[PDB]
């Protein structure tokens, strides 16, 4: 626990960036400036109870707006169904992680405020109140189902437990032994307030939204088709779209086969657009073939279709390269120089003469074997 | 592009299903922009004319035609639906639900075999047919 507390302290001190200049806008001053808000002086327990009631009411409004009358939310913010959900109802009940996270936040607030009202009633002592607050802030995961909806929150939970290990083993020295009487809730309260700071904008954005008012070739083909058919006479585009699509497929096939493609009756603007489309698709094709080959050779999990396709693509690419190499040999002539060749020939003839090698004759007609 | 015919209302769908008597009606519920629908529709166009003798393909937009969402549980980004003589054909792909494909296979031969099996089982009289392949495992290694 000490080591992990040090780890998080170091991470905070290292990932720290200086704060950025603002214009100093205060939310509550703006709220007070409007007619919808008014100021007063109230007991903390009273506003805690009022906030709990308002949260319960707002969650009820959000639930009922979706007409999800089959889900009931109690005063402890534990949402439970009342009947077996239909698949349509089950999909309708998918509130997302934001709603559940806000509900569990309101449940934690309800827990803290309820402990405070329990102390104010007089049922428990102030020491019991402080110890209960320490337990609440050290056992949020157990008392409240927060970690499932936000995974990162789990980290905070461990912090709290670590902090408990930091306090208890110092609190429980000397005459004091293990027991449920240790109340020191500064650390966990700090941690959960710091979590609330981070998650406040997310839940506000979610509530504002809820209360308002690979396949490059296919997309390339669709976009070029849209561009061509926009610049198309209305009365002629009935079959010319299919004809130009057939032309696009033929051009792609012709490029894939290293064969000339020159439609005589095709106008030169459409022909140039088709040439550009084929160039772009060929670049993507080559790049994705190389990427897939690297992925397969490295050892990535692939199915049969991918390998088959890659092999086909690579085959086409390798024959393109082989044709280029043959043409380069034809253009640049023989790569071996004449004197180099005669040196090799003299070496071979000297070897064979030194071996007294008799040349192999043409398969004799009466060959015995 | 999407040269495959589209149905713009529930009326087009419900007389398209009853239009074909000797051919299997294939309906793709989804959205063109949806990539998965793009893959499936490319596959379908690759085999649109191969199965012209015994099959037909229609594309239905969920936003344009949302009346079948509740009855057919059209909650996936994309579904493929097989009908013959007004009767739906369930296909046992091994994915858990036999009513809809709900996925885009890159190999057109798999879809050709699926539609051929559906046709064979529909003409023979079985309402539920078995896919000649198991799609529970992606067969990637």
């Amino acid at each position: 626990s000490y080591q992990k507390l040090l780890k998080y302290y170091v991470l905070n001190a290292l990932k720290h960036r200086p704060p950025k200049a603002q214009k100093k806008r205060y939310l509550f001053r703006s709220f007070k400036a409007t007619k919808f808000f008014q100021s007063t002086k109230l007991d903390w327990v009273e506003v805690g109870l009022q906030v709990c009631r308002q949260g319960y009411n707002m969650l009820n409004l959000l639930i009922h707006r979706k007409n999800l009358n089959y889900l009931h939310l109690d005063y402890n913010f534990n949402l439970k169904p009342v009947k077996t959900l239909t698949t349509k109802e089950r999909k309708k009940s998918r509130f997302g992680n934001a709603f559940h996270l806000c509900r569990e936040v309101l449940r934690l607030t309800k827990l803290v405020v309820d402990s405070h009202v329990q102390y104010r009633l007089g049922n428990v002592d102030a020491f019991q109140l402080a110890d209960g607050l320490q337990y609440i802030f050290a056992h949020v995961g157990q008392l409240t189902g927060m970690y499932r909806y936000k995974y990162k929150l789990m980290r905070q939970i461990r912090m709290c437990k670590d902090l408990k290990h930091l306090i208890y083993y110092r609190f429980n020295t000397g005459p004091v032994g293990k027991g449920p009487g240790c109340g020191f809730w500064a650390a966990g309260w700090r941690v959960w307030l710091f979590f609330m700071r981070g998650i406040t904008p997310l839940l506000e954005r979610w509530l504002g939204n809820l209360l308002a008012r690979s396949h490059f070739d296919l997309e390339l083909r669709a976009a070029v088709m849209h561009d061509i058919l926009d610049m198309m006479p209305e009365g002629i585009k009935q079959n010319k779209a299919r004809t130009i699509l057939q032309h696009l497929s033929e051009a792609w096939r012709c490029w894939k086969a290293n064969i000339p493609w020159k439609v005589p009756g095709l106008p030169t603007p459409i022909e140039n657009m088709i040439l550009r489309y084929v160039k772009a698709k060929a670049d993507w094709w080559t790049n994705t073939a190389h990427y897939n080959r690297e992925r397969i050779r490295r050892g990535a999990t692939v199915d049969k279709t991918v390998c088959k396709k890659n092999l086909g693509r690579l085959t086409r690419l390798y024959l393109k390269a082989e044709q280029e190499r043959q043409h380069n040999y034809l253009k640049d002539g023989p790569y071996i120089t004449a004197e180099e060749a005669v040196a090799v020939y003299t070496t071979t003839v000297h070897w064979l003469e030194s071996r007294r090698f008799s040349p192999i004759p043409f398969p004799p007609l009466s060959y015995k074997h | 592009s999407y040269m495959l015919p589209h149905l713009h209302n529930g009326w087009q769908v419900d007389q398209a299903i009853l239009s074909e008597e000797d051919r299997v009606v294939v309906i793709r519920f989804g959205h063109d922009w949806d990539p998965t629908c793009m893959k499936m529709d490319e596959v379908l166009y690759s085999i649109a004319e191969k199965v012209k003798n015994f099959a037909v393909i229609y594309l239905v937009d969920i936003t344009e035609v949302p009346d079948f969402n509740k009855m057919y549980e059209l909650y996936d980004p994309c579904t493929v639906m097989f009908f013959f003589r007004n009767k739906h054909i369930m296909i046992d792909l091994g994915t858990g639900n036999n009513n809809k494909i709900n996925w885009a296979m890159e190999d057109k031969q798999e879809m050709v075999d699926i539609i051929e099996t559906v046709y064979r089982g529909a003409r023979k009289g079985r309402g539920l047919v078995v896919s000649p392949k198991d799609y529970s495992t992606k067969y990637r290694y």
Partner: peptide, 13 residues
């Protein structure tokens, strides 16, 4: 026919 779907695709993408 094809253009009607192309305009829908372009608008939605």
């Amino acid at each position: 026919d094809i253009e009607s779907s192309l305009k829908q695709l372009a608008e939605r993408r």
